[PDB]
Design a protein around this ligand. Structure first.
Ligand code: HEM
Ligand SMILES: [C-]#N
Ligand SMILES: [Cu+2]
Length: 153
């Protein structure tokens, strides 16, 4: 569980993210597709995009990023009482996209990386630590939902 102070740090940095959701989205996907190459395989409209400028020029990928970071953002803003919008997400990533928790760890890693890259001044130790707790909670709860729909990845 997070303290109110931690939630404030999470949402402080997220409002910075919201100055440019689209560019953070691109950075986050490109970083994740590159540090953990198994991940880009799940997206099959994007795997004819074999270089960074190709990734950044794809409006499809960009829209996708916005969609993703918009869902994440709405989750973080509920400060843990996120069952209602976590449920549709687990339904898709568990029974269609089949994304294991490990992959959710890898994208959580990329998010943290991009946040530190773009917002050092706003992403110091306590802020990193709070964002990690928030993403950790998200993965705990989505894992529980995953199992309720079956599939223990
Ligand atoms: C912070 C965790 C993430 C969030 C908030 C997120 C959110 C979303 C959203 C909102 C959509 C569009 C609607 C839907 O089908 O659910 C989506 C689609 C998708 N996501 Fe995720 N996602 C997460 C992580 C992942 C990762 C780690 C994988 C890949 C390793 C992945 C792969 C997919 C795929 C394959 C689609 C379908 C794309 C389509 O054809 O539009 N997601 N995601
Ligand atoms: C979803 N990425
Ligand atoms: Cu994606």
């Amino acid at each position: 569980v997070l303290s109110e102070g931690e939630w404030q740090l999470v949402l402080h940095v997220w409002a910075k993210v919201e100055a440019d959701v689209a560019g953070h989205g691109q950075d986050i996907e490109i970083r994740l597709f590159k540090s953990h190459p198994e991940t880009l395989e799940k997206h099959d409209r994007f795997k004819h995009l074999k270089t960074e400028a190709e990734m950044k020029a794809s409006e499809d990928l960009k829209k996708h990023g916005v969609t993703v970071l918009t869902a994440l953002g709405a989750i973080l803003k509920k400060k843990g009482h996120h069952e209602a919008e976590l449920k549709p997400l687990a339904q898709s990533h568990a029974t269609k996209h089949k994304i294991p928790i490990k992959y959710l760890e890898f994208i959580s890693e990329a998010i943290i990386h991009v946040l530190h890259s773009r917002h050092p001044g706003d992403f110091g130790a306590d802020a990193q630590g709070a964002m990690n707790k928030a993403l950790e909670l998200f993965r705990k709860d989505i894992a529980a939902k995953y199992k309720e729909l079956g599939y223990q990845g």
